[PDB]
Design a protein around this ligand. Structure first.
Ligand SMILES: CC(C)[C@H](Nc1ncnc2[nH]c(-c3cnn(C)c3)cc12)c1ccc2c(c1)S(=O)(=O)CCC2
Length: 167
């Protein structure tokens, strides 16, 4: 858990302008969070990038998990292998408000982080999931009680998130 160059926002939330994949390779954290969907199909965005960094091992493991257990619910999670990226991957399904899912489920999604002492994570439901990224950061700060290191791969968004928190 050798995180470097993060800005501490609260006693348990840290943030950096960085690619989560590159952070996971450098830090080798105990847990890396994936911004998953309910069938664990890692077809693009953060999930596709994490799966590609495992050379598709994450997708094969995910298909086997779904075969035995069925899909997740929106706001839910599962713990699978971290492969070369972490000891464990916490696959968390935030709501996709561009597809009509309820933004209130973003609190349930962040509540999954509280079962793990230290996590490397992306900003849930942001990007093409359509949630307001400043609201996602507020829900993270208000909900997560364990130690979370957020990697946000966009300097323009990073700067707007830090400015909004420090208001
Ligand atoms: C808001 C943006 C900046 C953020 N992106 C990222 N945040 C952190 N590490 C990242 N690595 C890459 C990457 C690495 N290689 N490739 C080709 C992509 C993206 C990226 C983000 C945050 C949450 C979500 C998404 C995107 S999403 O659009 O994938 C939908 C799921 C929720």
């Amino acid at each position: 858990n050798s995180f470097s160059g993060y800005l501490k926002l609260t006693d348990n939330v840290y943030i950096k302008n960085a690619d989560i994949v590159e952070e996971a390779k450098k830090v080798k954290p105990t847990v890396v969070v994936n911004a998953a969907n309910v069938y664990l199909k890692h077809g693009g965005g953060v999930a596709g990038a994490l799966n590609k960094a495992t050379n598709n091992a994450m997708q094969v493991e995910s298909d086997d998990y779904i075969a035995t257990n069925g899909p997740l619910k929106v706001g839910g999670s599962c713990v699978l292998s971290g492969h070369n990226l972490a000891k464990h991957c916490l696959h968390v399904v935030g709501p996709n408000v561009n597809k009509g899912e309820d933004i209130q489920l973003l609190k349930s999604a962040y509540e999954n982080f509280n079962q793990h002492e230290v996590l490397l994570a992306p900003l849930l439901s942001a990007g093409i999931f359509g949630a307001d990224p400043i609201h996602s950061l507020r829900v993270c700060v208000d909900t997560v009680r364990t130690n979370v290191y957020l990697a946000v791969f966009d300097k323009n968004l990073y700067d707007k998130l830090v400015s909004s928190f420090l208001e």
